[PDB]
Nucleic acid binder design. Structure first.
Ligand SMILES: [Mg+2]
Ligand SMILES: [Mg+2]
Ligand SMILES: [Mg+2]
Ligand SMILES: [Mg+2]
Lengths: 209, 209
DNA sequence: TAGG
DNA sequence: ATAGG
């Protein structure tokens, strides 16, 4: 199983989980968390990294949350759309955390690390919601992240998600952009490509020492 | 001559500046900023990245700032040590910002990007202080950073600063650790080694445009 | 779990 | 675009 894949050896026992959130503004403490997608990763038989499990939830604004109109205009989210199928922060996070913990156990990792583009944004929103819903045994590292903007800057000399993906030879569709499922999925493929490219070029594994 | 080095071509026009901060706690809004060092970078004739200019300031706690005993126990800083030569947040940042702006213009970049270990920590402290002191024309990207924890995770499979440095084949002294200047300097050398390594393996420059 |  | 909503 995943115990025999080496995923747990690649990032010192950290289990990388790709996260994208859509929100009703820039403030994690006061603005509504509206949507979240999560994609766990796995290592294939040759040691290439690739997406494993995808999760996707539309989220009900927490009690008293702010909704900035320009954020809604940006992401195109109407909180009052009947077929959003919104669930509570607790419900969304509980299901994500459950799946992540299972992945961690089956992989022989010890903790999860959020992978996200300008990752402090998604981290701060995810942690605020976890606190709000008083979720227990949160498997994500409380402060460390794998920021794909920084990683893409190193590997591709690009920090903008669309451009980084394009530079890496991936498709990127402006029309699908800025939706949670799509952004998470491109970000996961981009992260996997940067790690895989490092291995291709002989940068990993390391030499004697 | 700085416009002739390619520093501005490496990171889509971002001017990387290594920052480490020492604090009287974990909260950038409520806890004192006690110390800060900055190291700007340059590219040599062969395209290798290396430290350029170093700055180092001890910082007077802002009015009403919290001072957590355990933080002081950790970093060894006595806020009321007469030898500390403390200056105001405004004075430290103004001088740091001034040197950074000079570097940006002389290298043909257009914006600085903070390089720091678990960079959200240092970024939030520098931004909080920059706001308190009403500094203008802050040259640092408002949200983007180059986190050496993530980059080291990729390049070296290590996220802890001491270990990443050792894995990169650098000296790392536990006795010098946790001083702003020493930590900034190691972080800068680490960042440069990771970037230089990527070029040595052929990952940069890229092949297909 | 290591940014003070 | 300084491009995480
Ligand atoms: Mg996003
Ligand atoms: Mg998005
Ligand atoms: Mg530090
Ligand atoms: Mg330090």
């Amino acid at each position: 199983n995943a115990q025999l894949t080496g995923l747990c050896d690649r990032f010192r026992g950290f289990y990388p989980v790709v996260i994208d959130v859509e929100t009703a503004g820039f403030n994690a403490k006061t603005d509504a968390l509206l949507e979240i997608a999560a994609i766990t990763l796995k290592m294939d038989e040759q040691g290439w990294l690739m997406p494993d499990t995808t999760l996707h939830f539309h989220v009900e604004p927490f009690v008293g949350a702010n909704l900035q109109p320009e954020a809604l205009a940006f992401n195109g989210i109407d909180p009052n759309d009947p077929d959003r199928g919104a669930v509570s922060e607790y419900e969304a996070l509980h299901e994500i955390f459950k799946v992540v913990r299972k992945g961690i156990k089956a992989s022989g990792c010890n903790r999860a690390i959020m992978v996200a583009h300008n990752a402090n944004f998604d981290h701060s929103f995810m942690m605020a919601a976890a606190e709000r819903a008083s979720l227990k045994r949160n498997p994500f590292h409380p402060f460390a992240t794998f920021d794909t903007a920084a990683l893409a800057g190193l590997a591709l000399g690009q920090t903008v998600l669309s451009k980084a993906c394009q530079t890496a030879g991936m498709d990127f569709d402006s029309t699908q952009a800025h939706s949670a499922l799509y952004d998470t999925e491109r970000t996961a493929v981009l992260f996997c490509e940067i790690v895989n490219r490092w291995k291709r070029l002989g940068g990993w594994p390391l030499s004697a020492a």
